[model samples]
Target: KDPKFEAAYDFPGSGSSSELPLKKGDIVFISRDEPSGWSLAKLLDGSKEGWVPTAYMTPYKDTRNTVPV
Candidate 1:
């Protein structure tokens, strides 16, 4: 399943073209969560996509979504 996570800390980016910079508390939509400790984070608008550390982000349960259970 696809998961959204709040960045746990600032990731200044590894200076690679495939890397995405992140600030604390920003939301990132992950398409591929790798078990090797990496994930592909993309913006909600699909403007940018890049690699992020799985340890740097974590899952957050939100209240404003369409699902209610």
Candidate 2:
């Protein structure tokens, strides 16, 4: 039996999604080096080793903030 439960997508706002106040559809930052569905991400709460979306992130405009997996 396989359950088709997909993950949620985060929005990339002006600052990194790891900043703070991660509201729904607020545009959080994402790292391309990470995998899809479940990947390591830095949270706004300073939780640099948190779990995020493997398919929710886009190329950051700054590029300086992107970390390789």
Candidate 3:
């Protein structure tokens, strides 16, 4: 299957950019199997380990970039 979040310029959230390797705009592919609540995942680049907001991050289309993979 295709990856989840495509790269973008800004974060979908109101929060500021974090030092987390996952920057404001980084491509991410989530495993179909995910945990509940706040979970950690790495970028496809295998660099970033971001604290993803499970509440905001979803399996649906990315609201920010809107770029289809």
For this target, which candidate reaches the highest TM-score against the unseen true structure?
1
lDDT of 1 by residue, 3-52 (tens): 77778988887774687688888887887878888788886567788888
Candidate 3's C-alpha runs over 4 A off are: 1-26, 31-36, 60-69
Backbone clash pairs in model 3 (N, Cα, C under 3 Å; residues 3+ apart or in different chains), count: 0
TM-score of 1: 0.74
**Residue runs of model 1 more than 4 Å from their true location after superposition:** 64-69
| Candidate 2 lDDT by residue in tens digits, 1-69 | 111112244433445454333334433333323434544444423345344555544433332566789
Candidate 3, residues 14-49, lDDT tens digits: the string is 442332233445556553334655435445665555
For all candidates, the clash counts are: 0, 9, 0
Q: Arrange candidates by TM-score, highest first: which order?
A: 1, 3, 2
lDDT (Cα atoms) of all candidates against the true structure: 0.78, 0.39, 0.46
Report the lDDT of model 2 for residue 11: 36
* Model 2 accuracy (lDDT, Cα): 0.39
TM-score of each: 0.74, 0.34, 0.36
Question: Looking at model 2, how many pairs of residues clash?
Answer: 9
Worst 10 residues of 3 by lDDT: 13-22
